[PDB]
Design an enzyme around this catalytic site. Sequence first.
Site, PDB file in Angstrom:
ATOM      1  N   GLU A  58     -13.022 -63.260 -64.288  1.00  0.00           N
ATOM      2  CA  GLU A  58     -11.738 -63.935 -64.151  1.00  0.00           C
ATOM      3  C   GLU A  58     -11.496 -64.965 -65.205  1.00  0.00           C
ATOM      4  OE1 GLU A  58     -10.307 -64.751 -60.456  1.00  0.00           O
ATOM      5  OE2 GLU A  58     -11.863 -63.750 -59.261  1.00  0.00           O
TER       6      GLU A  58
HETATM    7  C1  LIG Z   1     -18.105 -61.561 -51.900  1.00  0.00           C
HETATM    8  C2  LIG Z   1     -18.039 -62.363 -53.195  1.00  0.00           C
HETATM    9  C3  LIG Z   1     -16.951 -62.259 -54.070  1.00  0.00           C
HETATM   10  C4  LIG Z   1     -16.934 -63.017 -55.246  1.00  0.00           C
HETATM   11  N1  LIG Z   1     -16.030 -62.707 -56.202  1.00  0.00           N
HETATM   12  C5  LIG Z   1     -16.270 -63.051 -57.482  1.00  0.00           C
HETATM   13  C6  LIG Z   1     -15.529 -62.418 -58.550  1.00  0.00           C
HETATM   14  O1  LIG Z   1     -14.906 -61.349 -58.364  1.00  0.00           O
HETATM   15  N2  LIG Z   1     -15.594 -63.097 -59.789  1.00  0.00           N
HETATM   16  C7  LIG Z   1     -16.349 -64.261 -59.997  1.00  0.00           C
HETATM   17  O2  LIG Z   1     -16.335 -64.767 -61.144  1.00  0.00           O
HETATM   18  N3  LIG Z   1     -17.054 -64.796 -58.978  1.00  0.00           N
HETATM   19  C8  LIG Z   1     -17.021 -64.221 -57.756  1.00  0.00           C
HETATM   20  N4  LIG Z   1     -17.886 -64.600 -56.792  1.00  0.00           N
HETATM   21  C9  LIG Z   1     -18.670 -65.837 -57.073  1.00  0.00           C
HETATM   22  C10 LIG Z   1     -19.922 -65.535 -57.944  1.00  0.00           C
HETATM   23  O3  LIG Z   1     -20.571 -64.302 -57.500  1.00  0.00           O
HETATM   24  C11 LIG Z   1     -20.963 -66.668 -57.730  1.00  0.00           C
HETATM   25  O4  LIG Z   1     -20.318 -67.902 -58.111  1.00  0.00           O
HETATM   26  C12 LIG Z   1     -22.263 -66.567 -58.547  1.00  0.00           C
HETATM   27  O5  LIG Z   1     -22.832 -65.235 -58.618  1.00  0.00           O
HETATM   28  C13 LIG Z   1     -23.312 -67.477 -57.873  1.00  0.00           C
HETATM   29  O6  LIG Z   1     -24.521 -67.453 -58.634  1.00  0.00           O
HETATM   30  P1  LIG Z   1     -25.575 -68.637 -58.334  1.00  0.00           P
HETATM   31  O7  LIG Z   1     -26.773 -68.411 -59.188  1.00  0.00           O
HETATM   32  O8  LIG Z   1     -24.886 -69.979 -58.316  1.00  0.00           O
HETATM   33  O9  LIG Z   1     -25.975 -68.256 -56.813  1.00  0.00           O
HETATM   34  P2  LIG Z   1     -26.663 -66.946 -56.169  1.00  0.00           P
HETATM   35  O10 LIG Z   1     -26.045 -65.763 -56.856  1.00  0.00           O
HETATM   36  O11 LIG Z   1     -26.585 -67.151 -54.698  1.00  0.00           O
HETATM   37  O12 LIG Z   1     -28.184 -67.115 -56.592  1.00  0.00           O
HETATM   38  C14 LIG Z   1     -29.078 -67.870 -55.794  1.00  0.00           C
HETATM   39  C15 LIG Z   1     -30.349 -67.065 -55.621  1.00  0.00           C
HETATM   40  O13 LIG Z   1     -31.301 -67.818 -54.818  1.00  0.00           O
HETATM   41  C16 LIG Z   1     -31.918 -66.966 -53.854  1.00  0.00           C
HETATM   42  N5  LIG Z   1     -32.421 -67.789 -52.753  1.00  0.00           N
HETATM   43  C17 LIG Z   1     -31.709 -68.360 -51.712  1.00  0.00           C
HETATM   44  N6  LIG Z   1     -32.468 -69.045 -50.863  1.00  0.00           N
HETATM   45  C18 LIG Z   1     -33.742 -68.969 -51.418  1.00  0.00           C
HETATM   46  C19 LIG Z   1     -34.984 -69.493 -51.024  1.00  0.00           C
HETATM   47  N7  LIG Z   1     -35.195 -70.249 -49.924  1.00  0.00           N
HETATM   48  N8  LIG Z   1     -36.052 -69.185 -51.789  1.00  0.00           N
HETATM   49  C20 LIG Z   1     -35.885 -68.437 -52.877  1.00  0.00           C
HETATM   50  N9  LIG Z   1     -34.782 -67.900 -53.380  1.00  0.00           N
HETATM   51  C21 LIG Z   1     -33.733 -68.177 -52.559  1.00  0.00           C
HETATM   52  C22 LIG Z   1     -30.824 -65.943 -53.522  1.00  0.00           C
HETATM   53  O14 LIG Z   1     -31.417 -64.766 -52.985  1.00  0.00           O
HETATM   54  C23 LIG Z   1     -30.120 -65.740 -54.873  1.00  0.00           C
HETATM   55  O15 LIG Z   1     -30.730 -64.615 -55.578  1.00  0.00           O
HETATM   56  C24 LIG Z   1     -18.006 -63.864 -55.643  1.00  0.00           C
HETATM   57  C25 LIG Z   1     -19.082 -63.965 -54.767  1.00  0.00           C
HETATM   58  C26 LIG Z   1     -19.132 -63.191 -53.606  1.00  0.00           C
HETATM   59  C27 LIG Z   1     -20.367 -63.356 -52.758  1.00  0.00           C
END
Ligand SMILES: Cc1cc2nc3c(=O)[nH]c(=O)nc-3n(C[C@H](O)[C@H](O)[C@H](O)COP(=O)(O)OP(=O)(O)OC[C@H]3O[C@@H](n4cnc5c(N)ncnc54)[C@H](O)[C@@H]3O)c2cc1C
EC number: 1.5.3.14
Length: 459
Positions: A58
């Site tokens: 996006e």
């Molecule tokens: C349904 C949905 C639709 C969305 N739509 C979009 C879109 O179309 N475009 C866009 O830009 N963004 C979108 N997003 C947002 C985007 O996917 C997220 O902002 C981004 O992927 C988050 O990445 P992160 O590393 O911050 O978190 P996460 O991807 O949550 O990474 C955190 C990691 O930590 C792990 N974890 C959690 N607890 C523990 C623990 N206790 N011990 C060890 N590991 C653990 C999890 O398994 C995960 O692998 C969407 C998300 C979802 C879920």
Amino acid sequence: PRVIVVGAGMSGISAAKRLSEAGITDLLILEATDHIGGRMHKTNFAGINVELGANWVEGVNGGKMNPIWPIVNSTLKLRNFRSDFDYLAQNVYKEDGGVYDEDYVQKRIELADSVEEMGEKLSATLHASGRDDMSILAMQRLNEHQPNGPATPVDMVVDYYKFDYEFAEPPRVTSLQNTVPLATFSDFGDDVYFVADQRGYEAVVYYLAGQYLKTDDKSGKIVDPRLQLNKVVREIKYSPGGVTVKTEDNSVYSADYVMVSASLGVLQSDLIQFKPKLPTWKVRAIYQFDMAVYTKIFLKFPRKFWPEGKGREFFLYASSRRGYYGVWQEFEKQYPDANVLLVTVTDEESRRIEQQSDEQTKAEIMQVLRKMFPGKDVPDATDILVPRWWSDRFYKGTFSNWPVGVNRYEYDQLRAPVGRVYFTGEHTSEHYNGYVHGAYLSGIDSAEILINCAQKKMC
Ligand SMILES: Cc1cc2nc3c(=O)[nH]c(=O)nc-3n(C[C@H](O)[C@H](O)[C@H](O)COP(=O)(O)OP(=O)(O)OC[C@H]3O[C@@H](n4cnc5c(N)ncnc54)[C@H](O)[C@@H]3O)c2cc1C
Ligand SMILES: *[C@@H]1O[C@H](CO)[C@@H](O[C@@H]2O[C@H](CO)[C@@H](O)[C@H](O)[C@H]2NC(C)=O)[C@H](O)[C@H]1NC(C)=O
């Protein structure tokens, strides 16, 4: 220094990469599930891989380049298509049969857009401290001169498509100041491109990870022992001198620092115990921000019964119950001949639906579709897929949302480390909370903060 990174989602892999680039390679990435990618994750449905989480890049075609775009469109060339929302006015279904008159609907859309535009002007004049912020709903009442915002079915579904379908919570809970206008679009452009590639949107994460973690030359699979899957962190102990992290399977690890990338929902849940307890300022900032839920319900049918063609990709159902199965998408381009439809729900409906069976949800959706296509013989869906992100203890939601009441200073407390405990993830992105590019840049920024403190002692 040795650094443990909790989570192998986009921000965790991004942060580890940045650290490696600064020469900090003594890393240990502990991921709870059996795979990397987190919220970017595909699944097979109806013999095709669909996205359970993020699906669009996006913010494209604007003044600045969204860092993820080039990776998706050039480096990996993942198959994708620009979404066109221009024809929504021809596709708003009445609660009980057929679509509304297109001109009537286009004017309602215009009115809503116009109010939002006045909201953008207003938002620019508010104080940085947030002392004059208000919810988006309050801005709508003020710009329209009414005691309520959108309230007829058509006005409500248009409102839902314009705000809830982007933020996953209603305008009345959402901070105007911090969402209207939104940086993602203001900076990177108004277009959005839907990723529809069998390798999955997650391939972007795998690509980044392979730039520094070891992979097998035949398979291409990551084999670096610095990445350990199936490691659920349940306790993080810290002191001025270092940290110890314990996993659910009973392993125990030590390091100089820990970089926590789990989602805001996970942090609001207590899955991870901190010892000592995080300070009150930290705890309050964590619970005041919102972790929203956006549920992509996929359905497969024995035959098509909805329209296909120009402007047909997106369609709305104007129920008198706000947000009830309201936003639909059909994939004639993406998955030709597949007979799949996607309906999206959020917030209250998402929590209600995750708590009932798939069959029950399928039955509710069949009733709506029959109401929408009274002239057709609507076959029952042969298969349904209901993602349960809120119920999943490793996510507890889909993405953060900025609520009225929190100002920039408190949002920034989310990003703040506590001693040697650092945080990263989309909810710590300075201006892109809620997106894949926000998780990506957040890993880089969080890593740089730890690098300056650890390596140059400038904390
Ligand atoms: C349904 C949905 C639709 C969305 N739509 C979009 C879109 O179309 N475009 C866009 O830009 N963004 C979108 N997003 C947002 C985007 O996917 C997220 O902002 C981004 O992927 C988050 O990445 P992160 O590393 O911050 O978190 P996460 O991807 O949550 O990474 C955190 C990691 O930590 C792990 N974890 C959690 N607890 C523990 C623990 N206790 N011990 C060890 N590991 C653990 C999890 O398994 C995960 O692998 C969407 C998300 C979802 C879920
Ligand atoms: C996304 O990528 C495609 C893939 O390169 C772009 O389409 C090409 O762009 C150039 C630029 O001059 C042309 O010379 C090629 O002929 C194009 N290929 C095709 C198949 O048209 C496309 O413009 C890119 N989109 C964005 C938004 O950057």
